[PDB]
Coordinates of C-alpha atoms (C1' of nucleotides) and ligand atoms in Angstrom, one line a residue:
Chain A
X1 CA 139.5 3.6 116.5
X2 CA 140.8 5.7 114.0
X3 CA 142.5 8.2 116.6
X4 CA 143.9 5.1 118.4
X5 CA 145.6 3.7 115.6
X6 CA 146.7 7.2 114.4
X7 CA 148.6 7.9 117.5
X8 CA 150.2 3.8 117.8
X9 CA 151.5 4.5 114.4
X10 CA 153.0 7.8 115.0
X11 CA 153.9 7.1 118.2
X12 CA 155.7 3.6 116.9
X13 CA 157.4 5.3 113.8
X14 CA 158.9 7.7 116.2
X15 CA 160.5 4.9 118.4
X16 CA 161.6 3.2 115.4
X17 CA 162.8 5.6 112.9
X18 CA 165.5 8.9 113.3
X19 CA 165.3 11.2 110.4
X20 CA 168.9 12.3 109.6
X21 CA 169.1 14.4 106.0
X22 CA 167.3 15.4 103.0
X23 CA 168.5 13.1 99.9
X24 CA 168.3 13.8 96.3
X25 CA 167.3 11.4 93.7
X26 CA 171.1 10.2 92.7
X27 CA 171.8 9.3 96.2
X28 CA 173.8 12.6 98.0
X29 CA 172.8 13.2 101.6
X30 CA 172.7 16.7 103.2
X31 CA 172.5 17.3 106.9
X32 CA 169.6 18.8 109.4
X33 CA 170.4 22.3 110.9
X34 CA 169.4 22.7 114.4
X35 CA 166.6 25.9 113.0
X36 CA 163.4 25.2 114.6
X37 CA 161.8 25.4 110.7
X38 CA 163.9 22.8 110.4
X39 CA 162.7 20.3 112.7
X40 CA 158.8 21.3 112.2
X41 CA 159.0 20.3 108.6
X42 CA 160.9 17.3 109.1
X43 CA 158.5 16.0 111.5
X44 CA 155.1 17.0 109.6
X45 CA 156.9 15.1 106.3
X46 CA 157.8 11.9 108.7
X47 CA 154.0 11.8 110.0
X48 CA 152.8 12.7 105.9
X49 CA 153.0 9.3 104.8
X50 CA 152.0 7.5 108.5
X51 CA 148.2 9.6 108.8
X52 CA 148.0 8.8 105.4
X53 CA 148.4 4.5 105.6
X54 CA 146.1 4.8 108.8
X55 CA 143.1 7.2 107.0
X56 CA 143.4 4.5 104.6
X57 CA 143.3 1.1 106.8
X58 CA 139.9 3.0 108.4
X59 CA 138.6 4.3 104.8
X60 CA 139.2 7.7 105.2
X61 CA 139.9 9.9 102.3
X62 CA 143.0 12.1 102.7
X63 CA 143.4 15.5 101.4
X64 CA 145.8 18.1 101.8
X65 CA 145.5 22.0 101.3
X66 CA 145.7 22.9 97.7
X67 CA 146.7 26.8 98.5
X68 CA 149.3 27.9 101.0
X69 CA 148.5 29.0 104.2
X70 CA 145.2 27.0 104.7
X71 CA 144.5 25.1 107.9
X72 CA 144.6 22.2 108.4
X73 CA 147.4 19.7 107.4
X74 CA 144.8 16.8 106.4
X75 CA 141.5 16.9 106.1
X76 CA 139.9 13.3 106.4
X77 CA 136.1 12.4 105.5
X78 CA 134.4 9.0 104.3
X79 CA 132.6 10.0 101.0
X80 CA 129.1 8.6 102.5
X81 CA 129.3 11.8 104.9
X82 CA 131.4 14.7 103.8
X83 CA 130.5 16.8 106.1
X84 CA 131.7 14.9 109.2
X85 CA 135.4 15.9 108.2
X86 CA 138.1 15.7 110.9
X87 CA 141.2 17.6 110.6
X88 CA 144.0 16.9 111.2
X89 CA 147.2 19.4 112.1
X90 CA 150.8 19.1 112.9
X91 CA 152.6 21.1 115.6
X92 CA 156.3 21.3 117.5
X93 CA 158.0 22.7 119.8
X94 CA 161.0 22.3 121.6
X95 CA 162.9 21.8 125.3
X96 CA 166.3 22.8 126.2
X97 CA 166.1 19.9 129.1
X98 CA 164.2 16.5 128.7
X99 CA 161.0 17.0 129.8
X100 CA 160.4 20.4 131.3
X101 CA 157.4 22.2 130.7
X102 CA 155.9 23.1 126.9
X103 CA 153.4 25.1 124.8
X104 CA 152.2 25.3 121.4
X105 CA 150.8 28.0 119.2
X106 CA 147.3 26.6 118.3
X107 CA 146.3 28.8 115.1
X108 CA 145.0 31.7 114.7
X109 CA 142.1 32.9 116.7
X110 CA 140.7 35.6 114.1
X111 CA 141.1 33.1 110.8
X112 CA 138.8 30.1 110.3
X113 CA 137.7 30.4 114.1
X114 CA 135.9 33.8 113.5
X115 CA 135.1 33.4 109.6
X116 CA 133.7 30.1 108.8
X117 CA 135.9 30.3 105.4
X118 CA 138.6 31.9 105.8
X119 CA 142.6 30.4 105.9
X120 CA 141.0 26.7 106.1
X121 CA 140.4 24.1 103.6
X122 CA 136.8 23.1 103.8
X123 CA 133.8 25.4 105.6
X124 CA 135.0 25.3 109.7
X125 CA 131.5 23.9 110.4
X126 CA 132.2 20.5 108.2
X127 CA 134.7 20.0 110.9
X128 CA 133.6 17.7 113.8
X129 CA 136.9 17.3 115.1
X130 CA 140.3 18.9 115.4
X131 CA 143.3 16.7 116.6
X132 CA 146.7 17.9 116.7
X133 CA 149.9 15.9 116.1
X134 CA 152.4 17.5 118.4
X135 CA 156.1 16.7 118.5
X136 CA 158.0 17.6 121.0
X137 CA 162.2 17.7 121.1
X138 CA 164.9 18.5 123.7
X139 CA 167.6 20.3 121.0
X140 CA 171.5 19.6 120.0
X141 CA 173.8 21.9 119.2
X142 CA 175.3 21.3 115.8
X143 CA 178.6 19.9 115.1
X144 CA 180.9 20.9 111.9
X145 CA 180.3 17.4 110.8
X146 CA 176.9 18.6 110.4
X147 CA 178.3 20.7 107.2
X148 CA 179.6 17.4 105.5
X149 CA 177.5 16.2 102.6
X150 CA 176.7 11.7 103.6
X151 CA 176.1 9.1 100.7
X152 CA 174.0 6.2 101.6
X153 CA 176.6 3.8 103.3
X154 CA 177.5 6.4 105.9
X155 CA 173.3 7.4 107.5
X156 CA 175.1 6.5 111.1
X157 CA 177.7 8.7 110.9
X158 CA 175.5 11.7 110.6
X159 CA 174.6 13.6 113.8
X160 CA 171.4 14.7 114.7
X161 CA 170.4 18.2 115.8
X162 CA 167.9 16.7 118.0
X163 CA 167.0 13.8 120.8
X164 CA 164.0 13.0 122.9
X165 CA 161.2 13.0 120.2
X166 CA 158.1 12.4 122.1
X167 CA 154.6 12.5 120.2
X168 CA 151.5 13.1 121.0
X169 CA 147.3 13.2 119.2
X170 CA 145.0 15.6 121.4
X171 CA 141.9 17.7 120.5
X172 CA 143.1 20.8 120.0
X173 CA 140.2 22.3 122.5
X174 CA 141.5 20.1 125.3
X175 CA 145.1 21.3 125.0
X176 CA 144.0 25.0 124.4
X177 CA 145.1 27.5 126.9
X178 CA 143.7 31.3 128.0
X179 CA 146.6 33.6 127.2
X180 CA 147.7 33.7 123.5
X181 CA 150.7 32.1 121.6
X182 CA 152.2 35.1 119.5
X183 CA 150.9 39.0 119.4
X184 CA 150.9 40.6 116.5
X185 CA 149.8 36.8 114.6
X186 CA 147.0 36.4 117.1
X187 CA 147.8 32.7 117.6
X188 CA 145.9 30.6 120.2
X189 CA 148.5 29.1 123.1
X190 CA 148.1 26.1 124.3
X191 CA 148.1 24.7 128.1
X192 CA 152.0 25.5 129.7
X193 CA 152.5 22.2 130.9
X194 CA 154.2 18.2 130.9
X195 CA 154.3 16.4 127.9
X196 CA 152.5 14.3 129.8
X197 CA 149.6 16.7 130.5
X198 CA 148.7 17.1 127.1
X199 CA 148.6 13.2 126.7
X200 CA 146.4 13.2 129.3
X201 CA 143.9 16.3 128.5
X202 CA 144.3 18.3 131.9
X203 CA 143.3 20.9 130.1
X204 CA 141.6 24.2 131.6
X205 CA 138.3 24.6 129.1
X206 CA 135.2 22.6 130.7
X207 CA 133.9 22.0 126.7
X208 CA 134.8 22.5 122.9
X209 CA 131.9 25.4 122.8
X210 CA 133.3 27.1 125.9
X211 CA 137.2 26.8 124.2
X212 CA 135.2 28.4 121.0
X213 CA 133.6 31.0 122.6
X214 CA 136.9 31.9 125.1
X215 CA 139.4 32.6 121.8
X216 CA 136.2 34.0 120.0
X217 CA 136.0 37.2 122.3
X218 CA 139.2 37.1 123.4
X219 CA 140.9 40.8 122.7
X220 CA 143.9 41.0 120.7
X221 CA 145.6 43.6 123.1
X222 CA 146.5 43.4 126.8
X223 CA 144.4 47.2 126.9
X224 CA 141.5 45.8 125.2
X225 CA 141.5 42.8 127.3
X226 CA 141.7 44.4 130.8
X227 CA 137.9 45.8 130.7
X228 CA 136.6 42.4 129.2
X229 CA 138.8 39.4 130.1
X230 CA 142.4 38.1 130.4
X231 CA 141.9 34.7 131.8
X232 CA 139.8 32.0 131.9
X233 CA 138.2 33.1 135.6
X234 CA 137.8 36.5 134.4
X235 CA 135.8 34.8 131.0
X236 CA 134.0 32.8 133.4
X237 CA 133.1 36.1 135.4
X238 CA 132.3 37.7 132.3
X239 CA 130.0 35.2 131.3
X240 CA 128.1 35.6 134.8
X241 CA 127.6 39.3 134.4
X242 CA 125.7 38.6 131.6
X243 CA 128.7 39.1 129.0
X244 CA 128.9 42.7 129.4
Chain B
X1 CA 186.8 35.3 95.3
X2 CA 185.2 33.9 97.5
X3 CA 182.3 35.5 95.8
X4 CA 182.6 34.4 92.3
X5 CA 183.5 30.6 93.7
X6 CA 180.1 30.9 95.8
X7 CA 177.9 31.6 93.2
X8 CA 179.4 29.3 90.6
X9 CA 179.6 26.3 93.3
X10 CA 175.4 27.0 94.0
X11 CA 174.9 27.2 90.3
X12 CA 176.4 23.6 89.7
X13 CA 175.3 22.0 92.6
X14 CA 171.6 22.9 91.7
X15 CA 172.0 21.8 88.4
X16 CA 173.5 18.5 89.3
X17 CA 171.6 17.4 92.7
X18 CA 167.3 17.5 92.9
X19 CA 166.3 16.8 96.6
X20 CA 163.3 14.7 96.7
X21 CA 162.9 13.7 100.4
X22 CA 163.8 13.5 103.7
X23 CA 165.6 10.1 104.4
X24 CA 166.4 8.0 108.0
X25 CA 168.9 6.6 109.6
X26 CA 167.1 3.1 108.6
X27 CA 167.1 4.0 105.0
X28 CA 163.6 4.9 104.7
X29 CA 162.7 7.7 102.5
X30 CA 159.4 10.5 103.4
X31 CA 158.7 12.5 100.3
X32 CA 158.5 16.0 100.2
X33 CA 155.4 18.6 100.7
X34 CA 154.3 21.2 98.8
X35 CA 153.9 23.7 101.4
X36 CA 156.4 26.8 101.0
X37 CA 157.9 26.3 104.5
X38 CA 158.7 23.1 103.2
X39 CA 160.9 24.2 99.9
X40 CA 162.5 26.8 101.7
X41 CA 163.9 24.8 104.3
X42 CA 165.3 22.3 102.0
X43 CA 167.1 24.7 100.0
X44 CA 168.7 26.1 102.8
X45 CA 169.9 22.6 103.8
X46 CA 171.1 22.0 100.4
X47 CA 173.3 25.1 100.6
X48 CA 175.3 24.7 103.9
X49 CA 177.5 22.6 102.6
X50 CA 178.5 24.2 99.7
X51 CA 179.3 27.5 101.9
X52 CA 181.1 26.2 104.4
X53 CA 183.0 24.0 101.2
X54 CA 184.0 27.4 99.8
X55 CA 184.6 29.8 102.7
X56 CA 186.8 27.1 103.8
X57 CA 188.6 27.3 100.6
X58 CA 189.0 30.8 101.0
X59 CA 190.5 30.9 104.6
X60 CA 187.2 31.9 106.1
X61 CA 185.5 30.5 109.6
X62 CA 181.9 29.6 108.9
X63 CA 179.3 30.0 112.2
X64 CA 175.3 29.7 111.9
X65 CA 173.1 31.1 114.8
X66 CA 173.4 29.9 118.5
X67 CA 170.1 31.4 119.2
X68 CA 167.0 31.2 116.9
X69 CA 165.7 33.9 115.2
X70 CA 169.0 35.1 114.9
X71 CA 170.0 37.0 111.5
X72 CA 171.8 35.9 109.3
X73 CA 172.0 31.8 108.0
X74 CA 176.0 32.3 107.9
X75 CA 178.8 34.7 109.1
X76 CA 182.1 34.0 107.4
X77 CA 185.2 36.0 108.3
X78 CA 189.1 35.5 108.2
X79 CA 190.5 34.5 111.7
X80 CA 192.8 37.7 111.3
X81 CA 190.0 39.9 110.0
X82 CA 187.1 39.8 112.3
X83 CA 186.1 42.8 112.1
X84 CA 185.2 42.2 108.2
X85 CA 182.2 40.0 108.3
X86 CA 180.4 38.7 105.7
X87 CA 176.7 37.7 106.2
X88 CA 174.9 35.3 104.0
X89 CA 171.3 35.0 104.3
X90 CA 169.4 32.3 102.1
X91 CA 165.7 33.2 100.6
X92 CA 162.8 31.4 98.8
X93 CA 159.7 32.4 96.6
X94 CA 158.0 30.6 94.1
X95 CA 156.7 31.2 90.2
X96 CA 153.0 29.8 89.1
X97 CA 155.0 29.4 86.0
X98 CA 158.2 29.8 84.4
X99 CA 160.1 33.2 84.9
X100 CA 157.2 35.4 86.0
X101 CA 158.1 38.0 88.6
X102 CA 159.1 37.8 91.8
X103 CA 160.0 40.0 95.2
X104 CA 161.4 38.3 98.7
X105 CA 161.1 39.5 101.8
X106 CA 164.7 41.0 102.8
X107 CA 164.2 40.6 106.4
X108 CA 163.0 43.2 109.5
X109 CA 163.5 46.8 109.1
X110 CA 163.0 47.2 112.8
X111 CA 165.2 44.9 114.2
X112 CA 169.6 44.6 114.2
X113 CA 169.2 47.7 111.2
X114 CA 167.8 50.1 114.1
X115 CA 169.5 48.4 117.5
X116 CA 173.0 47.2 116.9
X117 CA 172.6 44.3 118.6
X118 CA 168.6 43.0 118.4
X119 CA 168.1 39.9 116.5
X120 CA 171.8 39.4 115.0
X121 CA 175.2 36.9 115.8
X122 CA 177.3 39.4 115.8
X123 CA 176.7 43.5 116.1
X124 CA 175.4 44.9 112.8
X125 CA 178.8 46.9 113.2
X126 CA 181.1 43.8 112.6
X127 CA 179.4 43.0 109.1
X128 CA 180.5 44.7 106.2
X129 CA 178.6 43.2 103.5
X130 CA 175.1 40.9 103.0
X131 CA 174.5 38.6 100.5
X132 CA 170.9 37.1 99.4
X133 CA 171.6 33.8 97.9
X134 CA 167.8 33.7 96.5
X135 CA 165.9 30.6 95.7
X136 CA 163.2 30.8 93.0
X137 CA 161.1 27.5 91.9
X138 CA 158.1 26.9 90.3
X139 CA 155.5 25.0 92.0
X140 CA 154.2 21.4 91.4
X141 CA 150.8 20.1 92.8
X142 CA 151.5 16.9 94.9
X143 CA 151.4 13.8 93.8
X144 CA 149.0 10.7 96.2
X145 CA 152.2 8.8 96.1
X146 CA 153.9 11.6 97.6
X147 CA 152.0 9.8 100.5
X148 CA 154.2 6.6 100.3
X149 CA 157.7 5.7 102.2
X150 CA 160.4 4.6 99.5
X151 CA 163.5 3.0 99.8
X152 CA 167.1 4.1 98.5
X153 CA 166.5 2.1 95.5
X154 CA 163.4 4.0 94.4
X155 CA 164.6 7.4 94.5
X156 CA 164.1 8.6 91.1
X157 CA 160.1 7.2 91.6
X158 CA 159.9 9.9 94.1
X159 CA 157.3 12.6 92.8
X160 CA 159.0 16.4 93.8
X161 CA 156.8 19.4 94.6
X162 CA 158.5 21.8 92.4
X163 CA 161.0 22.3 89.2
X164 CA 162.8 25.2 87.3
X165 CA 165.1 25.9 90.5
X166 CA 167.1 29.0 89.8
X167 CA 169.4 30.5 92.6
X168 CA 171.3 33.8 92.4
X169 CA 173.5 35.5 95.0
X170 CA 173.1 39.2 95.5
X171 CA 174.1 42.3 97.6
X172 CA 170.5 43.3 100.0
X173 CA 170.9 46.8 99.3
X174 CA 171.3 46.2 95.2
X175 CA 168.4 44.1 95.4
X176 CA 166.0 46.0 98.2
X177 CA 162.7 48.0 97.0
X178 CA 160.8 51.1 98.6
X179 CA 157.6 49.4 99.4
X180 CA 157.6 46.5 102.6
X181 CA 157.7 42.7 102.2
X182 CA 155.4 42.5 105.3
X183 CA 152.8 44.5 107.3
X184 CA 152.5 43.0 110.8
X185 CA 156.3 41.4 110.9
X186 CA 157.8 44.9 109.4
X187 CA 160.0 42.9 106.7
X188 CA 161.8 45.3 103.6
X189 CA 160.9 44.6 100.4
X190 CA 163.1 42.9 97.5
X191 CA 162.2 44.7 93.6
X192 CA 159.5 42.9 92.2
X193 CA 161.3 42.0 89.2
X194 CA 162.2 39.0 87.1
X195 CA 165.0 37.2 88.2
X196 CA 167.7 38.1 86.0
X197 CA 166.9 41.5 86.8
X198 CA 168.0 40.2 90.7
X199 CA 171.4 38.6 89.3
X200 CA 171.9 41.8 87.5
X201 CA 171.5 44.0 90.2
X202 CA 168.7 46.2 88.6
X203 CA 167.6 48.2 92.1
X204 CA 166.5 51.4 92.7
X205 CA 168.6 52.4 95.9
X206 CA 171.6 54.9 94.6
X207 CA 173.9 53.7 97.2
X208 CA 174.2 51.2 100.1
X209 CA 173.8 54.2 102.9
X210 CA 170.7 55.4 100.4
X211 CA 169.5 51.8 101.3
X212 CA 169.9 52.0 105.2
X213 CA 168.6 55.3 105.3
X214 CA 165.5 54.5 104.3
X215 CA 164.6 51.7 106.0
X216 CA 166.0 52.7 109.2
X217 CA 163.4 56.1 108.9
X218 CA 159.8 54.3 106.8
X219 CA 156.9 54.4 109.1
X220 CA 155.1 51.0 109.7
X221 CA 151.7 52.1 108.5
X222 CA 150.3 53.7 105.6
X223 CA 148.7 56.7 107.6
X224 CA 151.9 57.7 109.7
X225 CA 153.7 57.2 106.1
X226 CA 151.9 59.7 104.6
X227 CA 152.9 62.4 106.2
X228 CA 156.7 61.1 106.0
X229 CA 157.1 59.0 102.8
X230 CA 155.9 56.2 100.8
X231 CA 158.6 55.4 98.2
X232 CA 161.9 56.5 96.9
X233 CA 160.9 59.6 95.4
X234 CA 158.8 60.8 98.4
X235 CA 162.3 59.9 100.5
X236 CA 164.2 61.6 98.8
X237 CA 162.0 64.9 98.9
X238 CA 161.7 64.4 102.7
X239 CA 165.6 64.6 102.4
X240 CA 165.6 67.9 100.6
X241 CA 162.8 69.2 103.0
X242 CA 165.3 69.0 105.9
X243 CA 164.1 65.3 107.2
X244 CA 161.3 66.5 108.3
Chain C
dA1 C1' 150.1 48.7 97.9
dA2 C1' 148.7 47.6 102.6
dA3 C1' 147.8 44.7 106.0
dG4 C1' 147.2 40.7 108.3
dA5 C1' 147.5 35.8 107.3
dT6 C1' 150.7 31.0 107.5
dA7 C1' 154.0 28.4 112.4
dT8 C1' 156.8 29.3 116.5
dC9 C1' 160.1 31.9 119.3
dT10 C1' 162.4 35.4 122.3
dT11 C1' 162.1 39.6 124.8
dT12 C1' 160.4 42.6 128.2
Chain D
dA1 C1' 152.6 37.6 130.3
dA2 C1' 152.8 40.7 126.4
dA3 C1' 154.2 41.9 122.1
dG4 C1' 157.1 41.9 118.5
dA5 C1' 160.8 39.1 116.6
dT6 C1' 162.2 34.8 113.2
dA7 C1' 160.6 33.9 106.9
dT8 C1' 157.1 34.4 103.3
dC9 C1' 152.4 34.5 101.5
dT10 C1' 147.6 36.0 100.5
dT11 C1' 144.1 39.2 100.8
dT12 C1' 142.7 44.2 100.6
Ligands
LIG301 LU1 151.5 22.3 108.8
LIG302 LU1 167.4 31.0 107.1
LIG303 NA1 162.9 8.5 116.3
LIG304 NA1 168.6 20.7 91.1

DNA sequence: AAAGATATCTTT
DNA sequence: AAAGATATCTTT
């Protein structure tokens, strides 16, 4: 399938490939910092050209946002049904020790998932699915080397402010979590869990509609939340009362 | 000075070197994205080196943050002289076209210049100056073979998300407005001003204590502002009305 | 101008 | 777990 190739070629270019600087066009290397801007937007411009060859192979057109600050990264559709659209959205996060436990911000919860147009590409409800690419690193100090500039002949010299990539394509519903990501940007958090969890799916949500319906009425204040719900057995308790 | 070298060092270097992707330790080449995150971080990874190139010069130690989401990108001080340190903080916005106006976000008012010690390397009371080195580009729509891996012999094929780079290097307080960058992440605000008005210095803060003084007293919402005040003038009438 | 969007982290 | 930090933008 589509997905299934997506993730063997992302998963692949990762094993095979350690991103190391930025280069300019007459050949001078610059190093990574260890900033966790950093590493996001090295990894979403190593998976760029990746989703792109593998929309392709399945015919998929590819599309990224025109204005800043719209969700998601790619938008994919055949033209003989534009409004079967799957987007496409790239996350990371860190570890101080290989393999402990992680979580993601999943986007906003009062955007595009209250207000069918709003900070998103395309109408939400063209959208039949939403996978997310998610990196995860442990993370390297940096060394003083790492404030040399590198010409072409030395790209194994330079350190890295980073080891144990790992990868990972997962519905973004399956993944999602009950207690938010950030406060004051209203984010949606993912599971708190194993790498390997989120490869998996052991998710909490029983369906994509329940997930919807959770982060739709969720409060954006633990106040607010206490009389209505803070978890997902509270929502599920809520929803028995009749939604009161 | 260390100064003078800084700014003359940035100015050359941007003239003579265009980053255009992000290249591996195998020699492949991703191209760059549009998205502002994207610009931003690669102009701060083009600038390290030229820092720590001329702060070395000049007999000063060069650290970046252990932490993340620590202010400021550099802290350069004289072994003997640690008590004298110099902050430099790099900042990006864009222009739709050439030279229009433009304003930055100079960081939190709520943070290390209320609490010594929040959010900051070193106490707020170790630093004796902070310098913007400011970014300004004009954006470029992307390219579909900014969706293609290149090798080190195609560089100049790259397609680049931007041109017109202009940098500058400022005092915060010269540069710092009345009215706030953000809302919900309580940033100051910059002038909004062209840019030579920025390497000028064309600000409206009297002084540097002027400056602190009224960022360390603005309300963060209109309504508890108006009672207070809204801008420089309002400011300083609160000062004549006893500051109160 | 004001406020809340963009992604993710640390603090409490 | 809650909420406000990290930088900058768009909408109001
Ligand atoms: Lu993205
Ligand atoms: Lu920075
Ligand atoms: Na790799
Ligand atoms: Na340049």
């Amino acid at each position: 399938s589509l997905r299934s190739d997506l993730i063997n070629a992302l998963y692949d270019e990762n094993q095979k490939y350690d991103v190391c600087g930025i280069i300019s066009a007459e050949g001078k290397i610059y190093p990574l910092g260890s900033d966790t801007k950093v590493l996001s937007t090295i990894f979403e411009l190593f998976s760029r050209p990746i989703i792109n060859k593998i929309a392709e192979k399945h015919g998929y057109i590819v599309e990224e946002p025109k204005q800043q600050n719209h969700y998601p990264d790619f938008t994919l559709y055949k033209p003989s049904e534009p409004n079967k659209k799957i987007a496409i959205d790239i996350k990371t996060t860190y570890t101080n020790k290989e393999n402990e436990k992680i979580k993601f911000t999943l986007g906003g919860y009062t955007s595009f998932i209250r207000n069918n147009t709003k900070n998103i590409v395309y109408p939400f409800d063209q959208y039949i699915a939403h996978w997310i690419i998610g990196y995860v690193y442990t993370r390297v100090a940096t060394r003083k080397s790492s404030l040399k500039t590198y010409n072409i002949n030395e790209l194994n010299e330079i350190p890295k402010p980073y080891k144990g990539v790992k990868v990972f394509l997962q519905d973004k519903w399956v993944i999602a979590g009950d207690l938010a990501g950030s406060g004051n940007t209203t984010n949606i958090g993912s599971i708190h869990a194993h790498y390997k969890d989120f490869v998996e799916g052991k998710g909490i949500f029983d369906s994509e509609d329940e997930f919807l319906d959770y982060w739709r009425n969720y409060e954006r204040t633990s106040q607010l939340r206490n009389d209505k719900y803070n978890n997902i057995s509270e929502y599920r308790n809520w929803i028995y009362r009749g939604r009161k």
